[PDB]
C-alpha cells in the first residue's frame, strides 16, 4: 500500500518541475520518516525477491533526481546559490543513508562507492560537494564493519588511486587533511582486509615526501607517514630489499624536513617510528654485519651517521623531554628517542665509541645535560651487553661513582642507580675478566655499596637502590654485612616488592648470621602483627613471601632457597608477552639468511627448626584472627582476605613440597581452617552481589578478587609448589560460592543494555559487567579443569554443565560481542588433554562453531582468532575413541569446519594471517595423529589426507606461510621420545615437499620483473634450503636423500 505511494512520489520526483520537485522532496522525506514505509522497505529489501521497491531502487531514483538538477543547472551570487544547493543535496543524501542505515546495513556498498567515486572524480560541481561526499564516505562507509569487510580489493585500489591523485593536486588545507585521513584509512583497510598494495604504489608515497621538501607546511604529513609505516610493515616481509632501497632514498628527505623546518610532536613521533622501522629492517635484532644478517650499504651508513648527529642535537634541546605534569621539572627524555638512540649507538660504535658517552657524563654541568646520557648508557648496556668493552668496565664506574653522592637524594639519583644496576648485571654476565680488572672492580663496587647504603631510608628511591643492592648481591660483587640484615629487621623500612626481591637474592647468595633471633625478627618484620599489614595492601609476586618464610624456618636457609629457585619451568605454558610487534618479522629475516637455526639445537634431608615453625604458625594465625575479628561487610576489602588465604595456602604448599609435613596433615591443620573461614568471608561478598547486580562500585573489587583467584590456581602438571598451592586453594573453595559465581555468570550473560572500523573483539564494546563476567568465566573454567585431579567439596560436573548451558542454540547470540568473547574463551580453556572431556561435552562445545564461522565470514581478524581458539580442541579429539559414535560425530564437525576454511583458502578469499592460522591448525592435527586414520578433509565429495594438504602451503605466495610450513615440516617425519614414521611415508613426504618447493621456485622464476622478484628468488631459495635442513636434521632415514638433493 505505502510502497505504491513511495513509487508515485519518486516517479513524480523524476519530473522536471521545480515547485513540484520541492513538494515531492518534502513528501519523500516525510515517507522516509514513516515507520510503516520503513518496515515495508527493509523487509522487502532483506527478502531480495525482486519486488522492484527496495532501498537500492529508491536510492537509484534519488540519484536520477540529483543528476536531473545537475544537468538542468549546468547551463558570485550564482556560484553561492550553486554551492548552497550542493550543500543541501549532500545533506539530503546523508539523511537518506542515515535512515537507510539506522538499524542495519540495507544499502549495498557498491552503489554508494560508485556514487562517491563519480562525485569525487569530477573537479567541477564545487569542492564543497566533494568534501561532503568524502566526509560521508569516511563516517558512514568505512565506519561500518560489514562495509569494511565486504569491499573488494579492486575497489580498495581504485579508492586509493583516486584519493591519492586528488591529494597530489594542490587544494585547500582542510580538504587536504581530510584526504590524508581517508588515505590512511584506505591503506589500513587494504593492508588488513585484503592483499596488500602493489609495491609500485610506493612511488606515490615517495612523491608526496618530495613535496614535503618543497612546500614549507606539513598538511596531513602525519597521516601520510602513518600510512607509509603501515604499508612498509605489511610489505617488508617479502620485499625486504625493496623496502631497504626506498628507505635509503627517502630517509635523507625526512632528516632534512626534521632539521630545516620546525614541526609538531605527532610528526616527530611518526618520523621516529619510521626510523625505528628502518633500523629494524636493516639490522634485525641488532645485527651489525652482513654475515650476521644485516643489509648494509654506504648510503645507509651515511644516513646512520647523519641521524645520530640529528638525534644528539635533538637530545640537546628542551622540548624533547617528559611532560611537565604539574611542573616537577620532568628531566627524562621520552622512551622512543632513547631506544632509537641506543640502537643507533650500537650500530655505530673510528673515534665515536664509548669515549663520547664518558665525556658527556663527565663534562655535563646540570642534570638536564646529564640524565639523557645516563638513559642512553642504561639502555645500551641493558639491550646489548656486549657493547661495553671489558677494558671500559673499570673506568665507567668511576664516573658513575662521582655521580652517586649529593648528601641527599637528587633528580639524577634514580638514573645513576639504574645505570649502576645495568653495569653490575653486565659485569656478572661477562665472566671473562682479568685478575687486576676483577680487583679494581671489586674495590669500586665496595665503594659504591658504601655510598648507596647511606640514604637507604629515602623512601623516594627505594625501588632503585633496592634493585642496585639486589643486583650487586646477585653478582656476588661484595659480601653482606650485619647492617644489611639490620636493614630488614627492626621495622627500619616498610616491606615492599623490591625489598622482598632483595631479601630473596640475599638468602639465595649469602648465609644468615646469628644476631636464631635474626630469623624470627625478619619474620615478624614481614608479618608485622599490628590498619592493614603491608603485604595485604599490594599484590606480591606469586609464592615469594611464602618461599622466604618457609626457607627461614629451616636448618640451612641458603640450601632451601636454592632448592626453591632451582625448579624446572613449564615448556607449554611459559608466559604471554609481545602479542603484536615487528619482532616476529625480525625473526623471519634472521631465519631467511640462515643466521638463526631454531629447529636444530629432587632432594631430601631438609629439616625444620621446630620453634621457628610454631613461631611462624602463631604469627600467621594472629594475622588471620586480626583480619577475621576486625571484619565487616564493607569496612575491610575482601581481596585482603583472599590474599591472606593465598598466603596461608602457599606456606602450607611449600611446607608440603619440601616434605617436612605430610599433605594429609596440612588439611587437618588450623591454618587450613582459618583459610576456609577467610574464603567464606570473602564469598559472602559474591553472594551479596548475586542478590543485587545493578550496582557498579562492587564491580572493581569483584574483578580484583576474580583476577587474584585466577592467579592463585594453575593447570600445570609438574611437581612445583605451584601445583600443591593451587590444589590446596581449590580444595579451599565451597559449593555455595561456586554455585553463586555460576548464577552471576548466567545473569550477566543474558543481560541487555542499549582506524575506520573497530574490531568486534576490541575490548571497547565491553562494559564493566562484561569484564567481570569474563573474569568469572575464566576462574570457573580453571576450577573445572583443575578439579579433575582432586577430591573437592564442590562437584565439577555440575559446574561444567552450567558452563556449557551458556552456549545453547536457544540462548547464544553470536552477533553480540560478549557472546563471541565467552564462546572463544570456552573453546580456549575448557578442553584438556590430561583429563579429556567426555565426547558429549565436546559435541556440545563444537555445535555452534559452524554458525559463528558463518556469521563472521569475510572478516579476516575474527576468522584468525576463531582458528587460533579452535586449534585447542584437537588435543581433546582423537583420544582412544571411548564413545565411537560421538567421537566420529565430533571429528566430522571439526573436519567439516576445517575443510570449509581450506576450500575458501584455495580461492583468493583469506589473507596470509588466516592462512597461517590454518597452517597452525593443520600442524596441531598432524601432531594429533601422524597417520591420517581420521584427520581427512572432505571437500566437494573428495577426501584429502592432511599430510598432502600440509605440504601444499610450501608454495604459498606469502613468505611467512612458506617459512611456517617449512620450519614445521618435521611433523611428517616424526611421531612427536620421538618415534620415527614408517620408511614409505617418510620418503613419500620428502619427495612431495621437494617437488612442491621446486615447483614454486620454477613457477616464480620465469621472467616476471626480476628487479622486483630478486627478493622472490632469495625467499624461495631460502624456503627450499630450510626445508632440506629441517628434513636432514629431524629424520635420520632421509639424511643421504636430503644430502643428494642438496648437491643436485
Ligand atoms: Zn605446567
Swiss-Prot record:
<comment type="similarity">
    <text>Belongs to the PI3/PI4-kinase family. ATM subfamily.</text>
</comment>
<comment type="subunit">
    <text>Homodimer. Dimers or tetramers in inactive state. On DNA damage, autophosphorylation dissociates ATM into monomers rendering them catalytically active. Binds p53/TP53, ABL1, BRCA1 and TERF1. Interacts with NBN (via FxF/Y motif). Part of the BRCA1-associated genome surveillance complex (BASC), which contains BRCA1, MSH2, MSH6, MLH1, ATM, BLM, PMS2 and the RAD50-MRE11-NBN protein complex. This association could be a dynamic process changing throughout the cell cycle and within subnuclear domains. Interacts with RAD17; DNA damage promotes the association.</text>
</comment>
<comment type="function">
    <text>Serine/threonine protein kinase which activates checkpoint signaling upon double strand breaks (DSBs), apoptosis and genotoxic stresses such as ionizing ultraviolet A light (UVA), thereby acting as a DNA damage sensor. Recognizes the substrate consensus sequence [ST]-Q. Phosphorylates 'Ser-139' of histone variant H2AX at double strand breaks (DSBs), thereby regulating DNA damage response mechanism.</text>
</comment>
<protein>
    <recommendedName>
        <fullName>Serine-protein kinase ATM</fullName>
    </recommendedName>
</protein>
